[PDB]
């Protein structure tokens, strides 16, 4: 059978939407400072953190390691959940923190 992504069931993880569908969710379900994570289209094995500012949606690359850690913003983290915890408490863009996930609908 087909294996699901290890992050399936995380509130912020969307395994089967397109990039534009993620944007649409952030603009309709989400509010400013909402976020979600999906697998990268262009780099197999990577993830993308999508984040809504007042003017646009920004994407941040998350690159896993062979030992199942995750590189983001030049720094390694034990999990994607730890990246999210970090940027709820320290700004991800000037003036902005992560606030609410967009849940899988």
Swiss-Prot record:
The N-terminus is blocked. Phosphorylated by SRC and LCK. The phosphorylation SRC inhibits its ability to stimulate the Ras-GTPase activity, whereas phosphorylation by LCK does not display any effect on stimulation activity. Changing residue 59 to L: In basal cell carcinomas. Residues 12-102 form the SH2 domain. In placental villi, detected only in the trophoblast layer (cytotrophoblast and syncytiotrophoblast). Not detected in stromal, endothelial or Hofbauer cells (at protein level). It is found in: Cytoplasm. It is linked to Mutations in the SH2 domain of RASA seem to be oncogenic and cause basal cell carcinomas. Capillary malformation-arteriovenous malformation 1: A disorder characterized by atypical capillary malformations that are multiple, small, round to oval in shape and pinkish red in color. These capillary malformations are associated with either arteriovenous malformation, arteriovenous fistula, or Parkes Weber syndrome. CMAVM1 inheritance is autosomal dominant. Inhibitory regulator of the Ras-cyclic AMP pathway. Stimulates the GTPase of normal but not oncogenic Ras p21; this stimulation may be further increased in the presence of NCK1. Interacts with SQSTM1. Interacts with SPSB1; the interaction does not promote degradation. Interacts with CAV2 (tyrosine phosphorylated form). Directly interacts with NCK1. Interacts with PDGFRB (tyrosine phosphorylated). Interacts (via SH2 domain) with the 'Tyr-9' phosphorylated form of PDPK1. Interacts with tyrosine-phosphorylated EPHB4. This is Ras GTPase-activating protein 1.
């Amino acid at each position: 059978g087909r294996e699901e992504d290890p992050h399936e069931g995380k509130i912020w993880f969307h395994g089967k939407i397109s990039k534009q569908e993620a944007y649409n969710l952030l603009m309709t379900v989400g509010q400013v400072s909402s976020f979600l994570v999906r697998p990268s289209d262009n780099t197999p094995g990577d993830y993308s953190l999508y984040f809504r500012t007042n003017e646009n949606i920004q994407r941040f690359k998350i690159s896993p390691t062979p030992n199942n850690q995750f590189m983001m913003g030049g720094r390694y983290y034990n999990s994607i959940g730890d990246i999210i915890d970090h940027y709820r408490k320290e700004q991800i863009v000037e003036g902005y923190y992560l606030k609410e996930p967009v849940p899988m609908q």
